[PDB]
Amino acid sequence: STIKPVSVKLDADIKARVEHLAETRKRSSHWMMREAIREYVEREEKRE
Amino acid sequence: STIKPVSVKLDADIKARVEHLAETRKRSSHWMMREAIREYVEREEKRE
């Protein structure tokens, strides 16, 4: 399967807090946004 | 500047389920990705 790059407009406050958590959990800020989106659809689709 | 456009590499499977969920609730797929990320930091920051 291929990958689709989507542009997400984030405010500077949320974007900075996402980058801080990745350094403290040795993750990458790009990986956590994917996991944030992935868990969002999984939770909300099982409620439909 | 408090507006930063970030590119998130999403696979076609997650990219389609986010847009489908967005069509069924009339909020844009872009709005849910910002809310998906926002809830991730808020939940994970209270775990630190």
TrEMBL record, chains A, B:
Residues 4-44 form the Ribbon-helix-helix protein CopG domain. Coiled coil: none annotated. This is Transcriptional regulator CopG family. It comes from Shewanella oneidensis (strain ATCC 700550 / JCM 31522 / CIP 106686 / LMG 19005 / NCIMB 14063 / MR-1). The lineage of its organism: Bacteria, Pseudomonadati, Pseudomonadota, Gammaproteobacteria, Alteromonadales. The chain holds residues 2 to 49 of 102 of the full protein.
